[PDB]
Ligand binder design. Structure first.
Ligand SMILES: Nc1ncnc2c1ncn2[C@@H]1O[C@H](COP(=O)(O)OP(=O)(O)O)[C@@H](O)[C@H]1O
Ligand SMILES: Nc1ncnc2c1ncn2[C@@H]1O[C@H](COP(=O)(O)OP(=O)(O)O)[C@@H](O)[C@H]1O
Ligand SMILES: Nc1ncnc2c1ncn2[C@@H]1O[C@H](COP(=O)(O)OP(=O)(O)O)[C@@H](O)[C@H]1O
Lengths: 490, 72, 483, 477
């Protein structure tokens, strides 16, 4: 038996959401995806789960398409948007069952979405200014928590935030922009990480180039190349004439990725050029875009003012390892972090934590408008929208009420995946957010979210759990659009 | 077996003990070890053992001697 | 043998939820099809006809526990069920039945001597009504709702503190009379057996009287027959009026001419005699039943002290007070909207009286509410590794069998059992014996159970442990029977 | 659905584990495998059973693949990881049905793994490399109870040279080693005593007409994959240049004009070892032709027609990392076992170079770490102490199965073995696998490398947490 195909679509959507429900959050469980030929796949994020799940129901295909489209906008919240859409579908189906026509439900959902996006815009945070120091620090620590390095967390936090702030660009529109690839890793042997000091420029741990670099040279021009300066048998043997010509053009520090010159020592005390093997392309491109120079495949010909410049070069030993201090170039791209220790393998979690801290910092640096995470915003809008709906009086009152009630699934799912009873966490969140509006003096309480590590409510503006406003706005809009499209079906 | 010990190991130990020493050694139902059964004081009735032999032999012989069960 | 363990497991599971002050009361349908709702474990055990012999044996053990301690049966069932579950696990490991038998026996022996080191005894004596108040609160609060304990306990202990003489008590002295009507507030403590009568021609000032006991309740020719019947009943009432009798009882209804005849000789026609009253009355007055109206004599008569009608409680009730002992019997008037919620108060009062009697037998108290069980479990499981051999497994399972009690008590209050038991075990090694499981808080929190005053008797748990271990051992000693 | 899928995962893991749970120890039982035609084969190596068996559960396939990738990486111990993972997943049942989330169980498993690693590092007895007597003792501990018991004497010295002839100076001082660069030379025929070891890469191929200047006192091999290139080779004038194309008589004349010796039809498994041993380089682009074309190579070449067949001898190589190890005998039925057991010996030596230590065998290490974990669980509190104790109580399968497939009763022997670890401090006793009785393993003489034990425990814990992390199998069925 079967009837009301609308309910069938809603149930298909509910099943699709339940497939991915348990993976929401950083602590989500994995899914093992089996294809027809028997291969398996393990992943945490549900975006690739939707991209890999074999959907067959026409109704669920719409949710898959909308989630994929959401991925193309900002690349986050696909699990959240699918879950929110499914909750909306269930609640709208119940409203239909209680003799409310879907048209009024759709209108109420549209009004609720507009009211939510208007309410959020006046209760977000733009404090990611120059005065935001501790927030970034403990955001990095939260992204780096549950680790043995918590004893000396503050030093690594302020080091990484100084490194990320000191290297910012300024694009055409004036909005600051950050490349993650700008900063790289650099291992060291000996003492542990507590003595690691940030390097103002790119540093390569390899053979020593030359001692001809002074304490600080007035001009250090990056004449990067890609060939090996080797004697063979505008020159047939590329050792002297080309380097002489490039120095005549004004090349101070000629970079050689390949082998060093046999007689480079005499030429490096009068010109001060560079010769170190195995220059990484990932760092070569970054230093080229930093100083402003470009890689020259050939020199037999632009070369005087096009090459980049560096303010000073320092020759010193760091953690019993010689490093090249090509720093303070034209554009801030050249920087590195020394990893004091013994090897990169024993500090793999340390470098991964540094990388994820850099990522979570660059998420909030761009899109200066930011909102608290950990389900805080969902609870706040859930409190807002019930009071908004009770003042309508039309037939859309129940639609907006159910929208508000279903908007709480995200904190509930986060609590469920966090191994705490979602009832208590959600109730505590709602209770804290209630006095955030009925009590004007307790206004500094909206930024209360749930902490996944301890399973207790906790302020996240001070903690640093943050999200771009655009991500949540687009997620809400797309969930509402998908819900409306499904409800229009009959 | 009823005390949870190995059925054959205990019997092997008891047989070895009785073979090497003429004492009538028996099983100890707290450690699964050959026990002298005289100092411990676990004596059994003589007439009971005699009647046991007499009963078992006659019943076994009578059952072994039957054939062609018939529905009277 | 696993079938017996299974039957015992379901038996324990059936009544496990009723443990503690948050018992999930069940609906009971007796053979006469009465809609009956209660939370008492003994009542549901009585109505359930346990068919499996192992369940029958555990039920007999519980009955023996109730027969001489008066309370704690549900503890016995839960503990025996836990013991049998852990014994099943041990058997599946590979242990022989005998090994776990002596392991359980030695564990029980050790527990019996560990227990008396957990005593916070009674203050001074059975007197000081306000003290035996705090002593009697725990059992009443456990059986019936925790809300009404403050009054029910006071009522139940004021009546029992009347006669703490010579250190001898009898539960049958503390009787309970069922009076329908208003709420429990109007309930109070009276003295002497009490029930309701019909007639009003009664005298209050009565000395030692002569009490009747009944074992069986009640053209011209028509006028002649009526006159003959009238004269015959005249002869019957004159015979009952012989030897100067003043009261008459009957299990039937009243009669207009009969009440006229009783009033003529100033006889109180006591009626509404219950089928539960005929022989308890004889026991309390030393009388005997009479078949008909012809064989009353001076010898075959009862003797009371004072008979009158008291309108206290907004109802007319007759009272026989100041009997041969002059202070032996002491009833309690109960008031409730309906009977199904009145018998719950009755059985709670019975359990309170039994606990008071146990206190009379011994003044030792032990911190309840999961305190003593977890302490015993910790002590025994610490003693387990001090004993090399195959009995350590049984000893540790016995410690877990203790552990199973606060777990059930927590589950009955909607709290995660694992979290609360872990917290209790952790805090019980420093925040020692007197700490237990708090009920009011929905968070899995703990609280000391000495300032809270929730304590239960020592002999109660001693006998409960002994009987439960004996039941578990004696049900583990069977192997099979075809059925 | 929900937790039932995880229960099914761990049930499949448990059954695939207890298929071969009896096939370990010196007294392994023999499984029978029958193909769907009537043939019957009996085996004592769990890898074979897991190979020819067919499993319909993806979790079982994942565990089988884990056992596989653990086999090539370290060699033996393939059944121990399977048993340990199966038991840990089986003991996770009790907590999963108690409605506790898999996250806390996984976290408790991770702390337990850390504690076991610490305990193994603590209990390990130091061993110094290059000592031949205790090296032979290790060979008797591990390479024995196999088909090499009467042929282990030659395997001892073969491994003794092999561990010294694949040394790698990559990240530190000699601690890096590999197994697939040693130039194995397996040739059946003759008496087994002809096998030996030589320093330098060994090449089965040679020129068709060796009537030329083939062996020179300084072979500087140049790799290549044309007359113009023939003259361009003279840019540094090497003595040997190795290619992978055929050489003709006119080509040979060109070669002695160029004073180089080319080779043909050489497998890449030979060319890579040649390059590693001699440090050769490949270059053909005229722009790339620089001073870095020809690298210093070997220092001696020899021509030998060993076994009336054309061969090439390359000794005194620049890098003594791919040297010549020669295998001789009647058939290959044992020499492959010799190869895998000398691989185990090389792992012994490499871990001694990393951690110079050994651990007691016969379940002594398992019981010791179980006691350490159980005593450590007393102090630590929290809801997660139950899995922390359960892993310790479940890791004791190895002594349990050792006693089981020996005749002796498991329960009493295990109880006595525990009793000999808790009231005694520095004992670390174990169970004898032959007699099924308790014996001090430092007297019996059974030891295992730290590398294999650490790898087994880590892989078992990782497999357990992986199969507990898998929440759904929904991409189809
Ligand atoms: N550090 C954190 N603390 C609390 N919540 C977090 C944290 N990181 C991510 N989340 C939560 O995870 C949810 C979805 O994140 P994610 O799974 O990365 O995106 P997607 O679902 O698109 O893959 C967000 O709603 C956010 O609240
Ligand atoms: N406030 C309380 N908190 C925890 N436990 C309590 C409380 N009050 C009573 N109890 C427990 O109730 C138990 C006995 O009650 P119950 O099992 O219902 O009936 P019985 O008295 O027949 O065993 C005692 O073990 C006591 O510890
Ligand atoms: N003679 C022996 N006595 C006791 N234990 C042994 C003996 N030989 C091997 N073992 C045990 O066998 C284990 C490894 O062998 P086994 O489990 O059979 O195969 P695998 O090496 O694949 O695990 C070791 O842990 C070792 O303790």
């Amino acid at each position: 038996t079967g009837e009301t195909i609308r309910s069938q679509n809603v149930m298909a959507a509910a099943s699709i959401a339940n497939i991915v429900k348990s993976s929401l959050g950083p602590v989500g469980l994995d899914k093992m995806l089996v294809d027809d030929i028997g291969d398996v796949t393990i992943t945490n994020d549900g975006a690739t789960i939707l991209k890999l799940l074999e959907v067959e129901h026409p109704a669920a295909k719409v949710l898959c398409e909308l989630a994929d489209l959401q991925d193309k906008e900002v690349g986050d919240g696909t699990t959240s948007v699918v879950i929110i859409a499914a909750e909306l579908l269930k609640n709208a189906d119940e409203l239909v069952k209680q003799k409310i026509h879907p048209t009024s439900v759709i209108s109420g959902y549209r009004l609720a979405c507009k009211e939510a996006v208007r309410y959020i815009n006046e209760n977000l945070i733009v404090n990611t200014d120059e005065l935001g120091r501790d927030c970034l620090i403990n955001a990095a620590k939260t992204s780096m928590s549950s680790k043995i390095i918590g004893i000396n967390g503050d030093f690594f936090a302020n080091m990484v935030v100084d490194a990320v702030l000191a290297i910012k660009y300024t694009d055409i529109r004036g909005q600051p922009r950050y490349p993650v690839n700008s900063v790289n890793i650099l291992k060291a042997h000996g003492r542990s990480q507590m003595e690691s000091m940030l390097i103002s420029g790119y540093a390569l741990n390899c053979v020593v180039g030359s001692q001809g670099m002074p304490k600080r040279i007035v001009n250090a021009k990056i004449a990067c190349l890609d060939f090996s300066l080797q004697k063979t048998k505008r020159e047939s043997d590329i050792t002297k004439e080309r380097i002489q010509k490039i120095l005549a053009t004004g090349a101070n520090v000629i970079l050689t990725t390949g082998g060093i010159d046999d007689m480079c020592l005499k030429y490096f005390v009068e010109a001060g050029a560079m010769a170190v093997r195995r220059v990484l392309k990932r760092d070569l491109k970054r230093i080229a875009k930093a100083s402003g120079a470009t890689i020259l495949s050939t020199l037999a010909n632009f070369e005087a003012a096009m090459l980049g410049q560096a303010e000073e070069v320092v020759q010193e030993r760091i953690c019993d390892d010689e490093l090249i201090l090509i720093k303070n170039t034209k554009a801030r791209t050249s920087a590195s972090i020394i990893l004091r220790g013994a090897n990169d393998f024993m500090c793999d979690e340390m470098e991964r934590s540094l990388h994820d801290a850099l990522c979570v910092v660059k998420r909030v640096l761009e899109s200066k408008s930011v909102v608290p995470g950990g389900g805080a915003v969902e609870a706040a809008l859930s409190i807002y929208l019930e009071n908004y709906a009770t003042s309508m009086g039309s037939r859309e009152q129940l639609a907006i009420a159910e929208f508000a009630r279903s908007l709480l699934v995200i904190p509930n799912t986060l609590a469920v995946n966090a191994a705490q009873d979602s009832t208590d966490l959600v109730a505590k969140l709602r209770a804290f957010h209630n006095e955030a509006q009925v009590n004007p003096e307790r206004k500094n309480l909206k930024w209360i979210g749930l902490d996944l590590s301890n399973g207790k409510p906790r302020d996240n503006k001070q903690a640093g759990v943050f999200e771009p406003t655009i991500v949540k706005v687009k997620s809400l809009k797309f969930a509402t659009e998908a819900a409306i499209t499904i409800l229009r079906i009959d | 077996q009823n005390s949870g010990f190995d059925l054959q190991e205990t019997l092997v130990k008891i047989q070895a003990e009785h073979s090497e020493s003429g004492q009538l050694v028996g099983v100890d139902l707290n450690t699964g070890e050959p026990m002298v059964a005289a100092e411990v004081g676990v004596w059994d009735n003589y007439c009971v053992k005699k009647q046991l032999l007499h009963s078992c032999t006659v019943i076994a012989t009578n059952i072994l001697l039957v054939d062609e069960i018939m529905r009277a | 043998v696993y079938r017996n363990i299974q039957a015992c497991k379901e038996l324990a599971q059936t009544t496990r939820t009723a443990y503690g002050p948050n018992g999930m009361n069940k609906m009971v349908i007796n053979h006469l099809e009465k809609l009956f709702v209660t939370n008492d474990a003994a009542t549901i055990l009585r109505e359930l006809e346990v068919q499996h012999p192992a369940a029958k044996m555990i039920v007999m053990a519980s009955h023996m526990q109730e027969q001489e301690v008066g309370d704690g049966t549900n503890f016995v069932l839960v503990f025996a069920g836990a013991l049998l579950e852990l014994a099943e696990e041990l058997l599946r490991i590979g242990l022989s039945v005998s090994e776990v038998i002596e392991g359980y026996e030695i564990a029980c022996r050790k527990a019996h001597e560990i227990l008396p080191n957990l005593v916070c005894c009674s203050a001074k004596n059975l007197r000081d009504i306000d003290e035996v108040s705090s002593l009697l609160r725990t059992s009443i609060m456990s059986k019936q709702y925790g809300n009404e304990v403050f009054l029910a306990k006071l009522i139940a202990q004021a009546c029992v503190s009347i006669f703490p003489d010579s250190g001898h008590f009898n539960v049958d002295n503390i009787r309970v009379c069922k009076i329908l009507g208003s709420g429990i507030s109007s309930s109070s403590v009276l003295h002497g057996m009490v029930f309701k009568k019909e007639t009003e021609g009664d005298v209050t000032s009565v000395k030692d009287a002569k009490i009747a006991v009944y074992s069986c309740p009640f053209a011209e020719e028509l006028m002649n027959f009526s006159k003959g019947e009238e004269n015959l009943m005249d002869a019957q009432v004159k015979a009952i009026a012989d030897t100067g009798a003043n009261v008459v009882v009957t299990g039937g209804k009243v009669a207009d001419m009969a009440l006229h005849y009783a009033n003529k000789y100033n006889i109180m026609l006591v009626r509404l005699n219950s089928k539960w009253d005929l022989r308890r009355l004889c026991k309390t007055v030393g009388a005997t039943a009479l078949p008909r109206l012809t064989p009353p004599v001076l010898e075959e008569m009862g003797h009371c002290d004072s008979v009158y009608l008291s309108e206290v409680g907004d109802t007319q009730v007759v009272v026989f007070k100041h009997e041969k002992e002059d202070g032996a019997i002491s009833t309690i008037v109960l008031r409730g909207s309906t009977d199904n919620l009145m018998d719950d108060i009755e059985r709670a009062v019975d359990d309170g009286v039994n606990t008071f009697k146990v206190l009379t037998r011994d003044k030792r108290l032990v911190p309840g509410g999961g305190a003593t069980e977890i302490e015993l479990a910790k002590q025994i499981t610490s003693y387990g590794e001090t004993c090399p051999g195959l009995e350590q497994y049984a000893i540790k399972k016995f410690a877990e069998a203790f552990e199973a009690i606060p777990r059930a008590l927590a589950e009955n209050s909607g709290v995660k059992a694992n979290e609360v038991i872990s917290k209790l075990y952790a805090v019980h090694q420093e925040g020692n014996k007197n700490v237990g499981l708090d009920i009011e808080a929905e968070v899995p929190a703990v609280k000391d159970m000495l300032e809270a005053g929730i304590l239960d008797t020592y002999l109660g748990k001693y006998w409960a442990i002994k009987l439960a271990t004996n039941a578990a051992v004696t049900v583990l000693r069977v192997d099979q029977i075809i059925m | 659905s929900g937790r039932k899928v995880q229960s099914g995962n761990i049930n499949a893991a448990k059954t695939i584990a207890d298929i071969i749970r009896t096939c370990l120890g010196p007294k392994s039982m023999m499984k029978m495998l029958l193909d769907p035609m009537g043939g019957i084969v009996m085996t004592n190596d769990g890898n074979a059973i897991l190979r020819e068996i067919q499993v319909q559960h993806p979790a079982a396939k994942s565990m089988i693949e884990i056992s596989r990738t653990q086999d090539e990486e370290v060699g033996d111990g393939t059944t121990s990881v399977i048993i340990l993972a199966g038991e840990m997943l089986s003991v996770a049942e009790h907590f999963l049905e108690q409605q506790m989330h898999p996250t806390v169980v996984i976290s408790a498993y991770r702390k337990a793994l850390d504690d076991m690693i610490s305990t193994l590092k603590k209990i390990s007895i130091p061993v110094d490399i290059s000592d031949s007597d205790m090296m032979l003792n290790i060979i008797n501990s591990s390479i024995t109870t196999k088909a090499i018991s009467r042929w282990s004497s030659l395997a001892c010295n073969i491994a003794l040279d092999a561990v010294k002839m694949v040394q790698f100076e990559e990240n530190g001082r000699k601690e890096i080693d590999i197994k697939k660069y040693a130039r194995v030379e397996k040739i059946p025929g003759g008496i087994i005593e002809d096998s030996c070891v030589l320093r330098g890469v060994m090449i089965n191929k040679d020129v068709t007409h060796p009537r030329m200047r083939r062996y020179i006192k300084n072979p500087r091999i140049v790799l290549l994959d044309i007359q113009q290139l023939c003259e361009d080779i003279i840019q540094l004038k090497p003595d040997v240049v190795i290619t992978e194309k055929g050489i003709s008589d006119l080509a040979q004349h060109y070669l002695m004009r160029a004073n180089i010796t080319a080779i043909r039809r050489v497998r890449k498994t030979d060319n890579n070892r040649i390059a590693r041993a001699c440090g050769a380089r490949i270059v053909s682009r005229p722009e790339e032709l620089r001073e870095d074309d020809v690298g210093t190579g070997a220092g001696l070449l020899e021509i030998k027609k060993i076994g009336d067949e054309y061969f090439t001898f390359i000794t005194d190589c620049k890098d003594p990392k791919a040297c010549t190890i020669l295998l001789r005998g009647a058939s290959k039925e044992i020499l492959s076992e010799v190869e895998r057991n000398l691989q185990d010996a090389m792992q012994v030596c490499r871990n001694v170079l990393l951690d110079p230590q050994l651990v007691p065998g016969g379940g002594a290490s398992e019981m010791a770490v179980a006691h350490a974990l159980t005593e450590k669980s007393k102090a630590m509190t929290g809801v997660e102490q139950w899995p922390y104790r359960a892993v310790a109580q479940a890791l004791e399968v190895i002594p349990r199965t050792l006693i089981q497939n020996c005749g002796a009763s498991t329960i009493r022997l295990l109880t006595s073995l525990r009793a000999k670890h808790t009231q005694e401090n520095c004992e670390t006793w174990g169970v004898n696998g032959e007699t099924g009785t308790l014996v001090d393993m430092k007297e019996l003489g059974i030891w295992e490398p730290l590398a294999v034990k650490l790898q087994t425990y880590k892989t078992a814990v990782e497999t357990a947490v992986l199969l507990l992390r898998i929440d759904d199998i929904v991409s189809g069925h």
